[PDB]
Write a protein that binds this ligand. Sequence first.
Ligand SMILES: [Ca+2]
Ligand SMILES: [Zn+2]
Length: 402
Amino acid sequence: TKGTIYLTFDDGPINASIDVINVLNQEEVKATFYFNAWHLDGIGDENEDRALEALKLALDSGHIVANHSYDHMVHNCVEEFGPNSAAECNATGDHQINSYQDPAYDASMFAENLSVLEKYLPNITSYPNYKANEFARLPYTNGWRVTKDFKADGLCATSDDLKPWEPGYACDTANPSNSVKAAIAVQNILANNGYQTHGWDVDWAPENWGIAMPANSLTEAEPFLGYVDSALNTCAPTTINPINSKAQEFPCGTPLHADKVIVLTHEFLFEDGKRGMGATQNLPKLTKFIQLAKQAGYVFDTMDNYTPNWQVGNNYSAGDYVLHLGTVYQAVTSHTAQQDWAPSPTSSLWTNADPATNWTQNVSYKQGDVVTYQGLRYLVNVPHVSQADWSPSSQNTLFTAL
Ligand SMILES: [Ca+2]
Ligand SMILES: [Zn+2]
């Protein structure tokens, strides 16, 4: 195959999600939906009376449901959050301004998301494709927490003052905005609580946000496949436009990113309504893009498989990454997986390579790594694989207390 495409849809569930899902099912592909549950509450300022129907359809159809936070951080767009905040933020267009403020409260919106999803769909945890407690994507931000050595931040994603297109706008990646730093803190909180976060390589969006009906200008299937072609193995998160969509320190050539393209788009771009004739004009583009991509040799997959799940009988090379029960592991040696020898906190064949920064058992630590343990920070003096009796302490010379 040519490569793997991960179609990811942000900001549902809304009425428009249903026709998108129907096209996906027509074309026999699965996608990943990064949902904001405030649409279930009817306060997200979209056509969303069928939001619960949409959520159920996504899950019953086998699509992955992942975590985009309860309210898309819109509580940070207004003075006091309420049923009208979505409309208010849409009126000012200030979504990307002061988007992240208090990292604790902002990170709690991912937990809130889980509570509201489970409120509206009480048996949601019985779907294997419900993954919202393990996979997240931050509003506005091409941020990544995938493995211990695969992390990146959107250093111009959000602003303290001006939007990227406004006069006087400047981004200093060496001295980023307070909003950007708060988002980084949110990423780190989520990682320490077991989340992976993923950004995107290409964003399927209007070619012209300036016309009357912007959605109509969504890239045609044929040239959008060209964009995907151009992104395959070219470190797209560092070169993507606009500037607020960049992940400047993305680790180009990192092994898990090879031969893969993550597409970001939004089901609201596939709706006949306030943004244009999205359903009539753009659902056919979605259909033909999927068909063209398959015929060009791509396959479609979902974000639960971006890091491949550990599988009995698979051959692994030293250095390979897998997921096992939500945790990333890296292969210590080349071997063939057997059912009774799975990755674990004590496995000789695997070390934990989660993107967390709390001290963790069975991690291959490097000199200079910083860990947190019992509320204290420590710096690793020498590379080693952590084990239970080598936890940080003031007497453990593997570490220096900071
Ligand atoms: Ca995890
Ligand atoms: Zn979003």
